[PDB]
Amino acid sequence: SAKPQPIAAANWKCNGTTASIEKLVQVFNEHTISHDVQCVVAPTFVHIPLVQAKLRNPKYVISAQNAIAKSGAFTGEVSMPILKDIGVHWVILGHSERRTYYGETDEIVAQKVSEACKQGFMVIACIGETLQQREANQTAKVVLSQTSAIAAKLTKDAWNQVVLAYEPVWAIGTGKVATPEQAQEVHLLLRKWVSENIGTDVAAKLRILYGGSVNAANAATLYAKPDINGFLVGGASLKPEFRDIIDATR
C-alpha cells in the first residue's frame, strides 16, 4: 500500500479578526513541517489579502470557502475568475452549511464543481449524510448519489483536480466525531465506486478527507485507516493545535 499525498485543510468558516488571524498565521509560519502534506487555509473572502500577505509556510495554499462560476450581476457573491485574478486557485464547494442554509442542491454543487475544474481550480467537494439518513441505513445511497451527481458533470481528466471531503452532518461542530471504523467504511465505499465508475488509476490517486469534529487527539487514529487521506477541520483549525493535526498525517 502507498497512500496519495495527504491534505490538512483549515476551514475557518465565518470567523476571525485581523488581530487573531495575524497571531494564528504566525503560529503556522513557525511550525516546521517535515513530511509531504498539502496544507490548506480557507479564510473568509475579506481576509484573503491579509493571509496572502502574512502566510509564509511553503506547505500551505489559500482556499476560498465558496464561489460562483461567473462574474456579473450577482450582488454579494464572489466569482471564480475574480479569485483566480487575485491568486487563489483552491475552493471548497458544497459544504453542508451551504447545502442546508443557502439552498445548494446536488445539481448546483455539481455545476460549481464542474466550472471550477474547467477554470483550473483544485476543488474540495463536500458530501455526507444527516443523522436521519444514517439511522435509516441510507448512508451509502446518500453519499453515492451526491458523488455521482458531481461525477456526471466531470470528464475523467478533471478528477485530477478533485478532492472529496466526507463529513457526516451529525459530526460537524457537534463534538461527536465518527469512529475510525465508521469513516473508513464510507471512505472505502467511495473509493470503490470511483474505481469502478471512473477508473482504478483515478481511485488510487484520489484524496478522500474526513471532516467533523477532528481534533489533535483523534486525528492520528483516523489517519491510520487505509482510505483516509487527511482532514477538513473547522473548530480546531482556529487554534494552535492545528499544528498537531498536520503532524498526524505523517
Query: Residues comprising the binding site for substrate?
Result: 11, 13
Residue written as cell 448512508? 139
**Which of the following is catalytic: 47, 89, 95, 187?**
95
Smallest gap, in angstroms, from Cβ of residue 155 to its own copies?
A: 26
- The C-alpha angle 3, 246, 1, rounded to 5 degrees, equals 10
Cβ atoms 166, 143 nearer than 8 A: yes
Stretch that binds its own copies, among 2-10, 23-31, 91-99, 210-218 (CB under 8 A): 91-99
187 is catalytic: no
Q: Does 175 bind its own copies (CB under 8 A)?
A: no
Q: Contact with its own copies (CB under 8 A): which of 39, 61, 98, 127?
A: 98
- In our burial notation (b when 16+ CB lie closer than 10 A, e otherwise), range 18-35 reads eeebeebbeebeebebee
Find the binder of its own copies among 4, 23, 35, 74 (CB under 8 A): 74
* Shortest distance in whole angstroms from residue 129 CB to its own copies: 18
Phi, psi values for residue 208, rounded to 5°: -120, 110
C-alpha span between 127 and 79 (Å, rounded): 22
Read off φ and ψ for residue 177, nearest 5 degrees.
-65, 145
Which stretch in 25-33, 80-88, 151-159, 239-247 sits in contact with its own copies by CB under 8 A?
Answer: 80-88
The answer to whether 95 contacts its own copies (rule: CB under 8 A) is yes
Task: Give the dihedral of Cα atoms 142, 99, 128, 159; nearest 10 deg.
Answer: 90
Backbone angles phi, psi at 109, to 5 degrees: -65, -50
- 66 interacts with its own copies by CB under 8 A: yes
Active site residue 185: no
Identify the residue among 34, 58, 72, 155 touching its own copies (CB under 8 A). Answer: 72
Residues in touch with its own copies (CB under 8 A): 11, 13-18, 44-50, 65-66, 68, 71-79, 82-83, 85-86, 92, 95-98, 101-103, 172-173, 234
